[PDB]
Amino acid sequence: PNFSGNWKIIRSENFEELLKVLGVNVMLRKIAVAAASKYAVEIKQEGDTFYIKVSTTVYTTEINFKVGEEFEEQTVDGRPCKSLVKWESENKMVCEQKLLKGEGPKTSWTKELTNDGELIQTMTADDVVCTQVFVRE
């Protein structure tokens, strides 16, 4: 497939519950959920190599990886982790994360290109899954 594009969020579910599992207190949880309303994802994909830029109104960060090659990024609540992406199917990838320091919930994410031109991203902490849906700008 080709994940490349400028993606704008249209739907986000269970994000507060994910942040709660991660220990974020309620006021900052509500503020974070609001910020996810302007969540934008820019993807450049060349074969198995991905460049991903995640941005909100006031913050931007870049994730760079090749499928099957360990890299370092951060968890959803900002702790540094070692990550490894693999394909699950033609159009879906899954990333497993390992904390560099300390303990914490088991975290992962996925990206999927649907047949209807949507990008579905999920973020997981233990039993709670946040699902977010994007369309091309």
Ligand X SMILES: *C/C=C(C)/C=C/C=C(C)/C=C/C1=C(C)CCCC1(C)C
**Residue 35 token pair:** 């910020």
| Using rule CB under 6 A, residue 111 touches ligand X | yes
Q: Of these, 18, 21, 22, 63, which contacts ligand X (CB under 6 A)?
A: 63
Give the residue among 74, 135, 137 at the shortest CA–CA distance from 107.
Answer: 74
| Using rule CB under 6 A, residue 124 touches ligand X | no
Q: How far is the CB of 128 from ligand X (least distance, A)?
A: 14
81 dihedral zone (left: phi>0; alpha: psi -120 to 50; beta): beta
| Using rule CB under 6 A, residue 56 touches ligand X | yes
Q: Of these, 22, 65, 107, 109, which contacts ligand X (CB under 6 A)?
A: 109
Amino acid occupying residue 3: F
| Using rule CB under 6 A, residue 125 touches ligand X | no
Name the one range near ligand X by CB under 6 A: 51-59, 64-72, 96-104, 112-120.
51-59
- Tell me the CA end-to-end span of the chain in Å, nearest whole number: 18
| Using rule CB under 6 A, residue 99 touches ligand X | no
Contact 3, 121 (CB under 8 A): no
| Using rule CB under 6 A, residue 121 touches ligand X | yes
| Using rule CB under 6 A, residue 65 touches ligand X | no
Q: Which residues fall within 8 angstroms of residue 134, CB to CB, at 6 or more apart?
A: 7, 8, 9, 10, 41, 118, 119, 120, 121
Interface with ligand X (CB under 6 A): 32, 35-36, 39, 52, 54, 56, 63, 76, 109, 111, 121
